[PDB]
Design a protein around this ligand. Structure first.
Ligand code: SF4
Ligand code: SF4
Ligand code: SF4
Lengths: 359, 212, 66, 148, 191, 184, 111, 93
């Protein structure tokens, strides 16, 4: 019991500055400027989810809230904070609350990697395309405590099925980063976008890694998206999966934290295989997806904000392509999910690593 | 007495004090719950196809923020799109108790309002869904049009906005729990999970096959 | 990293101009133009989210000329 | 605007018979009967098409015949008068009641005229009718609305 | 930056031994398997303080990301084993192991504090991912190739030991004197 | 093989690429939807919305009660032996028990009961649906006389060829009702 | 198993209740009248329902513990609670969010 | 250089939990199908393979050709580990 006095010894000794320096939250301005761009990266991806999925179905999408659904990600996220989140009756309590936290704090901490904009980089760590695949492997644990602590039979079945899916698609995702870590001679995500900043478009890694972009793309969407996911129990293998007994603010981590995972996946397709904050000649004509003049005040305000946010704008394209793949591929079953990340995506991710070499 | 089924006098003063700041933080509490409320993808009888036609492209579901969530926990609204018999009446109260407390049932069709055309002579039909669960909006029709239920969403959306934030405590059920002991014999469960490998399907029994 | 010089023109001024464009031609827009309409919401989204309850896209009252 | 104060309550204390004009998508009327309910006024939201003759339902007792559906006989349920029996139940600390008549588009012009003058003769009783639609929530007195 | 690095050591060094006392002393075995990741994440957080950014990420990927997941898939395959739990099994020899561990800890702390360590004041690790992969192919090349044979064999045996024999389950292939399938021919006998 | 595996990926990832060309071409089409509270779709000429009642035309026959599937409408009549003709004193149909089968408006001798156009009846209270004789004897909400609602027509009312109600500047139904009264 | 008879007002479970979680028993029958507060109760009338609840459980203690027989107790309980409204003992709760008047409207006696 | 002051604050806000954690110490079948183990078993063998390739691939052009044949003996012997798991139905589900 000699460690009973130990944990309260450095507790109050740290608490004197843990309350005193508690008010100064996000004291660096490029940390607060990131978290606003982090939040509106996710809030687009909920608006872009409901609007692109309505466009492929020839319905409107959310009108009547905001101008054209601009507040529809906000009200869908604010109603979950206001709902009286009550636990199931016979269940765990501590494992139930940290259920969604272990799933989504990995995709929040590993948001510190992505260098969106030439003048917005939070920290250039010594790695980070390896720290991302390390941190995202904590997420199968949270799918096991969401499944266990919810204490119904069908969410254990959904918890063991969601964990064994994320198990299967992390190892081809590890080798798809190993292709562009071999070309870039490093894991630094500033060094990775620096090898693609030489010729603008013709030096992007998707032109050099046509298969490894496809290994990354199928493995990323098999860990964040809605297309290869049995959490909709339309096959009735479970009731509703591991996200069954989760209501209110804990479900908001399962709901909105799957869009942080979609954006962070898309933010790294547009760093590895596409040049992060890289773009062609600014002084272009009216048909350059811009205005009509050559030097507008609306075009001096674009490239100043495009200078701080271009990788996320590129990530807004692969968010759009992930929704356009949802209404294209069939909802494939779990027996053919795990026969893809092991029997198909693991050899062609290993073959690409040898073809990224000389062999 | 003097008036049957009376209304009890609210003896509390109902001091619902609200300044400019709390009323602004109450309009956001109501707008976020009316403009994005999620219906449980539920329905038993014919009236679900008048509700599933509202998921489609002609009448848009996700236009009022309705996203059909096929789980009782993630949903709040429950449009009772079907006749409730003696069976499924325990199942419906279970899907209603498994809900975060700003619930807002709306009835749908004649057979959840008063059990409409089975209200005359039918031995297992609940005559109205509000014999089981408390309902917000009613909706006559058999079936209603998909336009007619979107008016009942609009009538529901007008009812969320009236809800003050200081009345969140009255949304929880109260437990006037009483207990009693009985002498009823417990019956073994008749519905066990074996159908094909039950010991009566493999072969016809004796004293039956002789006449065959 | 300024207060509102190259930020207030992005958060306050230009989103009211996209809302003059988004309210005018969104449903009557083309197929090539609507791809640019989705980009204008997607790029200017921190400004369009701020001046969101200060503009309404509800259609005008009908004439009833009979 | 967004931060509406309590000006809606002051017009109902003055006019007594308001005529709301709400957006048809719904959800923006009821923020003005929270300002009304925070100021002591209880609210009784009725549906305007379900009322018959307004004199016989509101200020008089009415024989409401239930659906016998062939199995019962013709019962007559004499319900108490709506705007009277509800005035005798709110406490004397609280102020009057306001009739929040939704779906007021289908009332006759001689039924708003009865609802206008009824707030005069009855102390601590007001009405709000949701007649018509407009893109912004706007109100006017019912004596103005029967003119146009 | 010294005080923030110093008190984040004891914020992690207390987090690992509380989770280590959590995996050992808790009555629920499932709570131990989740707190086991609290052991491994803290030590992987302790390598960032010790300039080991690769092995920190190699611990989250393997220990937390793979081994802790493999524990949990095996914890929840054995949950119907024994709900009896006779914690006082036959005697109080569960406290007879409390003095041997504290005797080891008193022995090692006697060593650690009094041993003069040869601390080298050389500026360390200039991007130690290239100085860790030059060691995989110059110094520790032969451990690196043999660790591949280790992982093959640990996959041959564990697939063999944990598969369900659905090829031929009632197959006692021959007999001189009768031997059951997948059981050693030395039959149990009481003298 | 090492060449067979990297070339087994191109045969699918091209087929996925010409799957995304189809789904993006689904976004080329105009959203053929009905924005409800601002574009209410017009009900048909035989749509049975709710019943209308004429108290000066109901001579207490109780045919509506005998042909209703659940004997719903409450005809309340005295005999009035001074006049020797039953004059009713109350009439009410309890909507919400109503299926809108409209057997009462069909076997009506006096054309007193009649279906309206309005489906937009929905209350907070169940007993507010018990419409009186003077609550059923009101004006139906016509969809086209709303200065907020742009009413779009229905299929089998558009002209011949068009299958949508939004690109409809004018027109009529698909065929004339009496063209062959002056023609043939 | 949780044999239960849950109408709007009368929730009868076959078991005892420990803070929301119900453990199915064989001796007990728990009962919470009016979970959603549609009626304003008092201690004089709650004892009348609780004496009625003792009356039906003791009377029907020769039958079989099925969900049909619990649904007969909760039917006779809900028929008893409605007679306490037509006697004017209890009344409708106006503080409830919904006023659908499930047990009949308020009405005066003999006009 | 600001993530480390952030990363200090993620742990400095949880020191109140470590004080309370030390005071805390002082008809439902799931059928046993061994595929939950066997899919993580083959994951453990290959997550350990791939973490050996990260120091090789970062310093790939800085090592030579004999260090590329050496990394092939690592990789080609766990191609045999992968095709063992296919033929023996380890990852069948
Ligand atoms: S009222 Fe008609 S449509 Fe509705 S549930 Fe009953 S039978 Fe089905
Ligand atoms: S069926 Fe028609 S004519 Fe006959 S009593 Fe009824 S309303 Fe009058
Ligand atoms: S609407 Fe139909 S069911 Fe109802 S009373 Fe009239 S005929 Fe009978």
């Amino acid at each position: 019991x000699x460690x009973x006095x130990x944990x309260x010894x450095x507790x109050x000794x740290x608490x004197x500055x843990x309350x005193x320096x508690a008010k100064l939250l996000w004291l660096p301005l490029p940390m607060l400027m990131m978290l606003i761009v982090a939040t509106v990266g996710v809030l687009v991806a909920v608006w872009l989810e409901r609007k692109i999925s309505a466009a492929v179905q020839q319905r409107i999408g959310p009108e009547y809230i905001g101008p054209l659904g601009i507040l529809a990600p906000l009200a869908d996220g604010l109603k979950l904070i206001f709902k009286e989140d009550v636990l199931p009756a016979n269940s765990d309590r501590w494992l139930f609350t940290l259920g969604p936290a272990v799933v989504v704090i990995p995709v929040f901490l590993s948001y510190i990697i992505v260098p969106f904009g030439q003048n917005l980089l939070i920290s250039n760590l010594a790695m980070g395309v390896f720290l991302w695949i390390a941190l995202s492997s904590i997420a199968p644990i949270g799918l096991l405590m969401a499944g266990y602590a919810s204490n119904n039979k069908y969410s254990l079945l959904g918890g063991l099925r969601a964990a064994a899916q994320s198990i299967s698609y992390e190892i081809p995702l590890a080798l798809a980063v190993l292709a562009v870590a071999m070309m870039s001679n490093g894991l630094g995500t500033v060094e990775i976008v620096e090898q693609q900043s030489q010729y603008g478009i013709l030096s992007w890694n998707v032109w050099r890694q046509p298969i490894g972009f496809l290994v990354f793309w199928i493995a990323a969407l098999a860990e964040c998206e809605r297309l290869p996911f049995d959490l909709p129990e339309a096959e009735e293998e479970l009731v509703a999966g591991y996200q069954t007994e989760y209501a209110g603010m804990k479900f908001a981590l399962f709901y909105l934290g799957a869009y942080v995972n979609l954006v962070l996946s898309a933010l790294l397709v547009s760093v590895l295989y596409f040049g992060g904050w890289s773009f062609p000649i600014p002084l272009e004509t009216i048909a350059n997806l811009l205005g009509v003049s050559e030097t507008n005040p609306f075009l001096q305000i674009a490239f100043a904000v495009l200078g701080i946010t271009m990788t996320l704008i590129k990530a807004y394209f692969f968010v759009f392509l992930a929704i356009l793949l949802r209404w294209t591929v069939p909802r494939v079953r779990i027996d053919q999910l795990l026969d893809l990340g092991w029997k198909f995506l693991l050899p062609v991710g290993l073959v690409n690593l040898l073809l990224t070499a000389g062999l | 007495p003097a008036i049957l089924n009376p209304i009890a006098r609210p003896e509390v003063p109902q001091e619902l004090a609200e300044n400019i700041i709390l009323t602004s933080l109450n309009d956001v509490y109501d707008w976020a719950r009316l403009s994005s409320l999620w219906p449980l993808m539920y329905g038993t009888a014919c009236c679900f196809i008048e509700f599933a036609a509202m998921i489609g492209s002609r009448f848009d579901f996700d236009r009022f923020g309705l996203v059909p969530r096929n789980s009782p926990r993630q949903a709040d609204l429950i449009i009772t799109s079907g006749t409730i018999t003696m069976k499924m009446a325990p199942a419906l109260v279970r899907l209603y108790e498994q809900m975060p407390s700003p619930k807002y049932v709306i009835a749908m069709g004649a057979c959840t309002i008063t059990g409409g055309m089975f209200s005359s002579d039918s031995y297992s039909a609940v005559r109205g869904v509000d014999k089981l669960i408390p309902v917000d909006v009613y909706l006559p029709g058999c079936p209603p049009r998909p336009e007619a239920i979107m008016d009942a969403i609009v009538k529901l959306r007008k009812k969320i906005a009236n809800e003050h934030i200081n009345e969140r405590g009255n949304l929880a059920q109260t437990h006037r729990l009483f207990t009693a002991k009985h002498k009823m014999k417990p019956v073994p469960p008749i519905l066990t999970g074996q159908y094909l490998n039950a010991p009566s399907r493999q072969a016809p029994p004796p004293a039956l096959a002789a006449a065959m | 990293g300024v207060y509102g010089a190259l930020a207030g023109l992005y958060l306050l001024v230009v989103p009211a101009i996209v809302y003059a464009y988004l309210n005018a031609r969104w449903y009557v827009a083309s197929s090539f133009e609507r791809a640019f309409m989705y980009f204008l919401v997607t790029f200017f989204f921190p400004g369009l989210l701020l001046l969101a309850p200060f503009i309404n896209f509800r259609p005008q009252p009908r004439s009833l000329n009979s | 605007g967004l931060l509406a104060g309590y000006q809606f309550v002051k017009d109902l204390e003055s006019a007594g018979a308001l005529a709301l004009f709400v957006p048809p998508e719904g959800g923006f009327e009821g923020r003005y009967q929270r300002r009304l309910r925070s100021k002591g006024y209880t609210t009784l939201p009725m549906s305007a098409p379900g009322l018959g003759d307004l004199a016989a339902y509101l200020t008089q007792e009415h024989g409401i015949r239930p659906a016998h559906t062939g199995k019962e006989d013709i019962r007559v349920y004499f319900q108490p008068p709506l705007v009277t029996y509800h005035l005798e139940n709110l406490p004397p600390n609280a102020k009057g009641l306001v009739l929040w008549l939704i779906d007021g588009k289908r009332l006759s012009k001689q039924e708003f005229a009865y609802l206008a003058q009824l707030t005069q003769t009855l102390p601590k009783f007001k009405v709000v009718v949701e007649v018509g639609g407009d893109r912004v929530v706007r109100w006017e007195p019912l004596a103005d609305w029967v003119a146009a | 930056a010294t005080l923030t690095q110093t008190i984040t050591f004891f914020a992690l060094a207390a987090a690992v031994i509380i989770a280590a006392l959590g995996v050992v002393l808790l009555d629920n075995v499932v709570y131990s398997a989740f707190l086991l990741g609290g052991v491994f994440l803290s030590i992987a957080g302790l390598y960032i303080l010790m300039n080991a950014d690769f092995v920190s990420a190699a611990q989250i990927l393997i220990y937390v990301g793979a081994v802790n997941v493999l524990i949990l898939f095996a914890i929840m395959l054995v949950n119907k084993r024994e709900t009896y739990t006779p914690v006082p099994g036959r005697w109080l020899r569960q406290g007879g192991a409390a003095v041997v561990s504290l005797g080891v800890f008193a022995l090692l702390t006697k060593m650690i504090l009094q041993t003069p360590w040869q601390l080298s004041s050389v500026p360390p690790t200039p991007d130690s991912i290239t100085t860790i992969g030059q060691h995989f192919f110059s110094d520790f090349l032969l451990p690196f190739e043999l660790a591949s044979v280790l992982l093959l064999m640990a996959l041959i045996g564990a697939v063999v030991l944990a598969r369900r024999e659905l090829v031929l389950e009632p197959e006692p292939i021959l007999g001189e004197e009768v031997v059951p399938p997948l059981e050693l021919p030395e039959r149990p006998r009481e003298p | 093989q090492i060449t067979n595996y990297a070339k087994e990926a191109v045969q699918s990832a091209k087929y996925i690429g010409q799957g995304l060309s189809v789904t993006f071409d689904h976004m080329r089409r105009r959203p053929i939807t009905v924005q409800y509270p601002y574009e209410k779709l017009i009900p048909s000429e035989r749509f049975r919305g709710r019943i209308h009642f004429e108290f000066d035309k109901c001579i207490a026959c109780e045919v509506c009660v005998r042909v209703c599937p659940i004997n719903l409408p409450v005809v309340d009549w005295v005999f009035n032996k001074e006049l020797k003709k039953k004059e009713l004193k109350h009439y009410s149909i309890d909507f919400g028990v109503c299926i809108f089968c409209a057997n009462c408006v069909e076997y009506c001798p006096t054309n007193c009961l009649s279906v309206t156009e309005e489906y937009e009846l929905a209350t907070y209270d169940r007993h507010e649906l018990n419409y009186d004789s003077v609550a059923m004897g009101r004006i139906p909400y016509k969809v086209t006389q709303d200065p907020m609602v742009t009413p779009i027509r229905e299929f089998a009312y558009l002209p011949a060829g068009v299958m949508s109600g939004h690109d409809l500047p004018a027109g009529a139904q698909r065929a004339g009702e009496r063209p062959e009264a002056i023609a043939n | 198993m949780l044999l239960k008879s849950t109408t709007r007002h009368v929730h009868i479970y076959a078991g005892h209740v420990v803070d929301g979680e119900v453990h199915p028993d064989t001796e007990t029958l728990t009962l919470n009248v009016d979970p959603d507060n549609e009626l304003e109760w008092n201690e004089a009338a709650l004892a009348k329902v609780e004496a009625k609840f003792r009356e039906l459980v003791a009377n029907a203690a020769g039958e079989d513990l099925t969900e049909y027989n619990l649904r007969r107790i909760g039917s006779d309980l809900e028929h008893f609670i409605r007679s306490l409204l037509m006697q004017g003992e209890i009344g409708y709760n106006l503080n409830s969010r919904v006023r659908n008047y499930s047990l009949g409207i308020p009405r005066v006696n003999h006009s | 250089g600001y993530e480390y002051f952030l990363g200090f604050l993620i742990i400095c806000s949880l020191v109140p939990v470590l004080a309370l954690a030390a005071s805390a110490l002082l008809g439902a079948w799931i059928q046993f199908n061994v595929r939950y183990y066997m899919f993580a078993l083959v994951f453990v063998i290959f997550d350990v393979e791939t973490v050996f390739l990260y120091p090789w691939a970062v310093a790939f052009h800085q090592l030579g050709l004999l260090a590329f044949i050496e990394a092939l003996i690592f990789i080609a012997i766990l191609v045999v580990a992968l095709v063992y798991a296919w033929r023996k139905r380890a990852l069948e589900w």
